[PDB]
Amino acid sequence: GQIQYFNVDENPEQVRKLIEQAGLDPDELREAEVIIIIISRTPEQLEKLSRQVKELGADRLLEFNVDENPEQASKLAKTAGISEKQLREADYIILILVRDEKKAKKFADSLRKKGSLEHHHHHH
């Protein structure tokens, strides 16, 4: 899978379009601090990933599956600059909406620690 990051105050039209493509009103979601988007090709793989981001206490969550809603998964991938081929070969997509560039890395530091094998300070 892949992770993407967008800043609400610096790319307002990108975040507006991601929330509108998700079928939500960004004009109503204006009170949210963080929005996380999970898209996976099976609902079983999506249910792992949504629980994995829920451990961090993310302020808003939205979930889609490529087999149930291929058109909506494709629309959000297109908005993130991702091809329909890239959506298919990656198994899953994560899109993170944040108010600052360091807040994205603060969240990513958990995802990078959960990924790979570690026991003796292997990487970074």
Side-chain angles (χ1 to χ4, degrees):
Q2 66 169 277
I3 309 155
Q4 295 296 341
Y5 313 91
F6 309 100
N7 292 3
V8 193
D9 287 283
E10 297 184 275
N11 299 281
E13 296 181 271
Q14 177 67 1
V15 183
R16 167 170 290 284
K17 196 55 56 193
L18 283 171
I19 304 303
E20 286 174 0
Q21 293 269 58
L24 294 179
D25 290 285
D27 303 275
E28 298 297 296
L29 276 301
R30 194 249 75 194
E31 296 187 273
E33 192 184 293
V34 181
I35 308 89
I36 308 188
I37 305 190
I38 300 298
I39 314 180
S40 196
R41 62 84 178 209
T42 71
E44 183 259 286
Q45 288 173 249
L46 134 72
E47 278 274 33
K48 269 71 175 69
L49 292 164
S50 63
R51 219 74 78 260
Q52 282 171 259
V53 299
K54 186 178 174 69
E55 287 178 63
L56 281 290
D59 188 59
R60 224 294 187 182
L61 236 300
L62 58 103
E63 291 168 87
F64 305 125
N65 165 249
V66 193
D67 188 69
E68 287 285 273
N69 294 276
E71 194 72 84
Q72 300 302 109
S74 185
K75 280 171 183 172
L76 275 92
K78 287 160 180 289
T79 308
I82 309 174
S83 174
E84 296 97 301
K85 278 291 192 293
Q86 290 170 337
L87 174 62
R88 183 178 176 87
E89 77 186 286
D91 271 77
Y92 71 95
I93 316 303
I94 306 190
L95 321 174
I96 287 169
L97 295 312
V98 289
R99 226 54 43 97
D100 187 87
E101 55 164 66
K102 303 306 194 296
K103 198 179 183 75
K105 222 300 181 68
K106 212 298 96 72
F107 201 100
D109 192 66
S110 74
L111 296 183
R112 87 183 183 92
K113 184 178 179 180
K114 284 176 174 290
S116 301
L117 280 65
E118 221 302 87
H119 78 325
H120 279 108
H121 310 116
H122 297 171
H123 291 351
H124 196 310

